[PDB]
Design a protein around this ligand. Sequence first.
Ligand SMILES: Nc1ncnc2c1ncn2[C@@H]1O[C@@H]2COP(=O)(O)O[C@H]2[C@H]1O
Ligand SMILES: Nc1ncnc2c1ncn2[C@@H]1O[C@@H]2COP(=O)(O)O[C@H]2[C@H]1O
Lengths: 200, 200
Amino acid sequence: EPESDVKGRILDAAADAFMLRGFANTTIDDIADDVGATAGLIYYHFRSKFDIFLAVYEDGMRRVRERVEPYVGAPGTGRQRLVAMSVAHVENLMIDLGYHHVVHQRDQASTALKVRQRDALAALNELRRDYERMFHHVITEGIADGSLRNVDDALATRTLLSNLNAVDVWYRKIEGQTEKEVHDLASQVVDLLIGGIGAT
Amino acid sequence: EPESDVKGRILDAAADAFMLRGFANTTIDDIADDVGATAGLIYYHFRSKFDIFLAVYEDGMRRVRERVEPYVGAPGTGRQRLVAMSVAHVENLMIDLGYHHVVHQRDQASTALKVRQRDALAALNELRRDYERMFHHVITEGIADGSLRNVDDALATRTLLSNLNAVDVWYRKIEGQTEKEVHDLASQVVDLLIGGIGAT
Ligand SMILES: Nc1ncnc2c1ncn2[C@@H]1O[C@@H]2COP(=O)(O)O[C@H]2[C@H]1O
Ligand SMILES: Nc1ncnc2c1ncn2[C@@H]1O[C@@H]2COP(=O)(O)O[C@H]2[C@H]1O
């Protein structure tokens, strides 16, 4: 098996474990069990549980950006782009739920992080801010072009992003739910966020 | 000082401490420090940190219900009632943010809870479900009366509740912000959730 494929299975297992039990209670042994190996294989690829967390965060950010970024500068009104970006964001959340949990999962901790880990975390947090700024940019454009309501752009951006991510309060993966079924659920959610619940 | 007033100060301090540091890292000493007393005063009123958590949850549920319930059966369309209920919910979140954090804050824990504590927790969780069901009832009514869009009532309820609570991602209390200023911010948030961000 290619080493990149083994790493991917580790990240998949770790993302789901961190989601299920939380970072603090997840162990390297949990992750090893879920990929069919020993702790030694995990440590060969990642030196610590926090390094695995950082790698999950990095991969989650890459995946969501690759799904959403193509729409930001595409032809269309602000609303058309915002709908496409928002559906893609929610679809990514629904497909890669464990990665989403990590991306969105304290300064006061029991042990110090390594210097390298703190630098990597800060860079990932800035990447997440850069990603969220794409929504602010499109919302500002849509307010200006009239496809969105004349509301406060900062409040609308913070509200919309919190709402897209709040799908994680209730959504759980269902085995055998199809790609279109997940896309359709994401579309229904975004229809409520952009079109509202109130009539006319 | 009346004992009920001392208890209220303890709950206020604990709600803010649990918000700031989390339940696990908060200590009885933290709470004692914040009310100007010793751990002994805290233990006189509440036997354990989890008992304080339960009392915060209970008081948070009482406060939100008292603010929101009067609207559920009041005269008005489903949308009119939903707007009033939602503004009241968000205002309660903004005013009593630490209580809100507790109400919305694992089965696998390091120590067993007392029997009495597990019973109390289960009852509080059912009270929270009863509260959220008021929104489902009004959304169903508003779909039927045409004041809300013909959308799926279960999805709309889960989405709306997650969105009302997701204000906590970005909102922080500002000292000296007035009651009307907080009410107005809550109204702006609810305007986005009910009316949508998309134009016309
Ligand atoms: N993958 C999914 N597809 C469709 N509906 C879902 C999915 N995940 C969660 N839900 C809905 O969210 C609800 C949350 O509580 P329930 O498990 O009672 O029922 C759930 C479904 O109605
Ligand atoms: N109480 C509040 N009143 C008005 N705006 C707020 C309040 N709390 C948070 N915000 C907004 O939410 C933003 C979150 O990040 P900032 O602190 O950069 O700036 C904040 C404000 O724009």
